[PDB]
Paper text:
[name] activity is regulated by autoinhibition, unlocked by recruitment to specific pTyr-containing motif pairs.
In the latter state, an aromatic amino acid from the top of the WPD loop (corresponding to His426 in [name]) moves to cover the pTyr with a π- π stacking interaction. While the dissociation constants varied, mutations to the “Loop” region (containing Arg362 and Lys364) consistently lowered the difference in the p0IRS1-ppIRS1 pair, unlike other regions.
Author numbering:
A (entry chain B): 627 to 635
B (entry chain A): 4 to 282
Amino acid sequence: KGSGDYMPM
Amino acid sequence: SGFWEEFETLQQQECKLLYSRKEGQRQENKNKNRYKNILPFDHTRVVLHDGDPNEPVSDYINANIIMPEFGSSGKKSYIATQGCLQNTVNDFWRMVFQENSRVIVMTTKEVERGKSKCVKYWPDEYALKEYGVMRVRNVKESAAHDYTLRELKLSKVGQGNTERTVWQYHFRTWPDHGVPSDPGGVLDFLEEVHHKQESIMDAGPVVVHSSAGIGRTGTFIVIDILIDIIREKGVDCDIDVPKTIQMVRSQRSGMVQTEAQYRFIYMAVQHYIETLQRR
């Protein structure tokens, strides 16, 4: 959360 | 778990240095990516030609060509891409036009859980819109249970006889979390997509998108590839899900993101096989 990364999660 | 270890083996194979992604890392391209960590491989990216000569970098979209086999024609290939950003709608239609794509598969809503997964890139029904140099008309929408089909007409402003129909298959009921609990809706959808694509002479690759262009995108593409193998070679053909995922991951990183998507792929193949038996 908040990293700016895609997490399909 | 057979699935867990198969999927974990694949995930380990991507915990390493992969092919170059330098174009997506250029400063001029940073706001063209929805996610900083999801970038196209340089060698299979869709290179956009014919851009505004005033724009220093006009050849980039976060998208890759995906061939199911090494010598695949364009018609049997895919483009895996992210949902449009507000500032990449025009580049998306440049891509569709240039690659002669006639079918788009959208695997998200525009917004899910308050987050934009794709900015709207089609006109309202019956309306005409200009997207940069491209003109699009939404001719007609047809609603089905799990998806909406939009018949779009795309042309290049200031070049006449460039018009072509682009069929947007918009899957609308994928769950906000996880995967559908059975694959019937997805299989019925892909059957319509496949018949539409097959019917168009010299169609370019089918465009498939999700918020990042890899999770749901990879799941739809790998299912479509596997059921076409069965379509051609019949229900007792060899099916190799890990090898097919590896083939597509050599062309865009991270295709198929979760163990639930991996299980869903197997489920869809089994249901399609079963269908070829009942009818």
